[PDB]
């Protein structure tokens, strides 16, 4: 008749060969028997062992009298012969995760159903860190008891993840800007942030100071009222950062802005995002313009603090 071997895939370990050039041997190419009804072959299923053990596929037939049984937690290799696989934990926000046999079997003894009975471990399907921190999956060993508690070592199983002591900020026109990981752990859970507020990866959008205030990244808390305000303070997050005595180039010479002299006066709020922005990088505005109203013509008017027309003098050094 001509016929042979049907693998079993499983979505997380080596296939299961199943071999009819065995049970043909035995049975003496009787057919109807494992195809009349323990396999449809019409529109199959899918059976875990269990449903075996139940009598259902295998479970028909190898229970122990007939066949070596599906319960035997010390001859359950004999059919998943496989060679490894590690598993993967692909989730859509967090470091693929990964848990393997080979380096958890030699600590028990060989124990297999230790964890493929108890219905707590290999329960849930989408478990999750909640229902994890409650002792399902994973948790249910690794519970601060038998095993270090799951409300850390999160590099240890997933991809990458183990957070960073300090992280920094690179900024061109500003300078740097530090925040403190550590710290602002032993006030806060993982998700508190990660991901709505932050990513895990390395790269997403770079926010900027103003998107703070419509509430992302540092914003979504630094606002002045749960956490301290994302508008000043500056020296902050951002290191030496300081409002300090400039120097432009201009065509005729040098120009001399002080922040002293109108910090005494004004607020950053006052010139800052509407009138100047920070980073040296800007747009040089023309004496035409600060004439027309705009920079530092927007109160150098003659009528508020003095003309950009007359007393060139003060701002230039010629
Ligand atoms: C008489 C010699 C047999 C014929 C005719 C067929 N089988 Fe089998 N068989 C068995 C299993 C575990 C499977 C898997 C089914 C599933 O996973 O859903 C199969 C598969 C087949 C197939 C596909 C053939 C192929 O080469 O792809 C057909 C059409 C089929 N079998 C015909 C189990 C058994 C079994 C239990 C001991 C016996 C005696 C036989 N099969 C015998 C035959
Ligand atoms: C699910 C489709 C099955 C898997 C997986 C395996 N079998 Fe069977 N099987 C049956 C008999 C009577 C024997 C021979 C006698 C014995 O050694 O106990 C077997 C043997 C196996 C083996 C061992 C092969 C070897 O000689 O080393 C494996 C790994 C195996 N089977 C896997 C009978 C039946 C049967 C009853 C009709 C069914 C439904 C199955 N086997 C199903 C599977
Ligand atoms: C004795 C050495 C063992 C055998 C044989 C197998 N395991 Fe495991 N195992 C564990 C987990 C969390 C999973 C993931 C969830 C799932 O797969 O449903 C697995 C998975 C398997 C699978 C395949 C699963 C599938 O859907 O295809 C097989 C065939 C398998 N395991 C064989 C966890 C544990 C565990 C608890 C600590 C132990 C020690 C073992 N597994 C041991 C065995
Ligand atoms: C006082 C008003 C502040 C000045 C001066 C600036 N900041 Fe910040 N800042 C913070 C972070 C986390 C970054 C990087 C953001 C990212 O990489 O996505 C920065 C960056 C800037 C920038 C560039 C973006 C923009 O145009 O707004 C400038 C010009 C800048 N900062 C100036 C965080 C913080 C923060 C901690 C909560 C505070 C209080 C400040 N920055 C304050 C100011
Ligand atoms: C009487 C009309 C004045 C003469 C002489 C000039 N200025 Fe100024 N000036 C100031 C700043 C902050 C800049 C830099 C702006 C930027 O970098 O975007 C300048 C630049 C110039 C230039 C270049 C513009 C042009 O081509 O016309 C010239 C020619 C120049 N300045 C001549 C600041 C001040 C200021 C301090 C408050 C006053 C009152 C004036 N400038 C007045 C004159
Ligand atoms: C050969 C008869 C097997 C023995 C012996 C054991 N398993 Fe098995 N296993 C086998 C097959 C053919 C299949 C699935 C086929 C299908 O219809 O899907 C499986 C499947 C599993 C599973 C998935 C089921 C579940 O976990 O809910 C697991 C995890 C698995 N097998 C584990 C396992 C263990 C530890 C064994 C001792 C109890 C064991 N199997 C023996 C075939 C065979
Ligand atoms: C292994 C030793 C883990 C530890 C410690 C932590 N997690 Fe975990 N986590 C692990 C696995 C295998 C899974 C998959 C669960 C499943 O559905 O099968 C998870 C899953 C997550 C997820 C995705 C689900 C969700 O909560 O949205 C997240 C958010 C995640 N893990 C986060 C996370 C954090 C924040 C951890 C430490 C602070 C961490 N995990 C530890 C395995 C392990
Ligand atoms: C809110 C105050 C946070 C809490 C609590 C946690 N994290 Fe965090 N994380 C936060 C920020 C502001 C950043 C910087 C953004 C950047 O892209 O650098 C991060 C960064 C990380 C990283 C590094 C990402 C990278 O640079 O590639 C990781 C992987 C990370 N955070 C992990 C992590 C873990 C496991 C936490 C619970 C212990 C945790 N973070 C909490 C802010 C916050
Ligand atoms: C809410 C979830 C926050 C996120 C995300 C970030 N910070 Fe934070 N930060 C938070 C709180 C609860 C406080 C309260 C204010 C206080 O007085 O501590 C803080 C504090 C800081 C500090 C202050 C240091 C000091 O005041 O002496 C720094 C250095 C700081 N935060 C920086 C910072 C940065 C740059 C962040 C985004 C990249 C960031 N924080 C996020 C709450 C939250
Ligand atoms: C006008 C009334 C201002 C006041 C008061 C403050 N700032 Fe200022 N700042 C102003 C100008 C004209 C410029 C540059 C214009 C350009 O586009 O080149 C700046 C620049 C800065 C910078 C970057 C340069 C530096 O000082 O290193 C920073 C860091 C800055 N200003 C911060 C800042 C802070 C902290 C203020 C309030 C406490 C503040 N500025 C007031 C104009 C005005
Ligand atoms: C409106 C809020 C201002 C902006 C924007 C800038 N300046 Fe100013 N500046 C302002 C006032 C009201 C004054 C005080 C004197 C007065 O009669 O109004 C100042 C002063 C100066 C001075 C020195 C004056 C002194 O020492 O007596 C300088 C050096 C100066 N301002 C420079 C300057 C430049 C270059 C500006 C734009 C790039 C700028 N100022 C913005 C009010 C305002
Ligand atoms: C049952 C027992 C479990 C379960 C349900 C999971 N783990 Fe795993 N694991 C367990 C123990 C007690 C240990 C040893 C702890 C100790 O030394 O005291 C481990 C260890 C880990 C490690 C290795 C750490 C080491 O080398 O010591 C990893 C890689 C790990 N466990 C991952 C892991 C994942 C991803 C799990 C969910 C799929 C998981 N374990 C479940 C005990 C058990």
Do not use: W
Not at 50 to 72: N, Q, Y
Not at 112 to 138: L, W
Not at 281 to 288: D, E, I, K, N, R
Request: proline share 3%; net charge positive.
């Amino acid at each position: 008749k001509e016929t042979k071997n049907v693998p079993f895939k499983l979505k997380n370990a080596a296939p299961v060969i199943f071999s009819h050039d065995i049970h043909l041997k035995k049975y003496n190419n009787n057919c109807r028997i494992c195809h009349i009804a323990l396999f449809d072959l019409r529109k199959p299923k899918r059976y875990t062992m269990l449903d075996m053990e139940k009598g259902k596929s295998c479970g028909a037939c190898h229970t122990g009298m007939k066949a070596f049984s599906v319960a035997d937690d010390s001859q359950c290799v004999r059919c998943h012969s496989g060679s490894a696989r590690p598993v993967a934990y692909r989730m859509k926000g967090a470091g693929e995760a990964v848990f393997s046999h080979e380096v958890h079997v030699p600590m028990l003894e060989g124990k297999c159903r230790t964890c493929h009975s108890n219905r707590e471990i290999t329960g849930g399907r989408n478990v999750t860190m909640a229902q994890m921190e409650k002792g399902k999956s994973c948790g249910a060993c690794h519970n601060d008891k038998m095993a270090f508690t799951v409300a850390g070592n999160c590099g240890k199983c997933h991809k990458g993840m183990t957070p960073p002591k300090t992280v920094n900020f690179k900024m061109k026109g500003v300078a740097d800007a530090a925040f403190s990981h550590e710290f602002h752990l032993g006030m806060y859970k993982c998700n508190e942030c990660h991901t709505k507020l932050f990513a895990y990866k390395a790269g997403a959008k770079r926010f900027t100071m103003a998107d703070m205030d419509k509430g992302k990244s540092c914003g979504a808390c630094h606002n002045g009222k749960d956490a301290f305000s994302s508008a000043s303070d500056c020296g902050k997050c951002h290191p030496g950062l300081k409002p300090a005595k400039l120097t432009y180039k201009t065509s005729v010479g040098e120009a001399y802005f002080d922040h002293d002299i109108h910090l005494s006066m004004f607020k950053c709020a006052d010139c800052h995002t509407k009138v100047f922005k920070y980073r040296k990088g800007s747009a040089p505005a023309t004496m035409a313009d600060m004439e027309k109203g705009k920079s530092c013509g927007v109160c150098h008017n003659g009528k508020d603090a003095f003309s950009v027309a007359d007393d060139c003098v003060k701002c230039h050094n010629m």
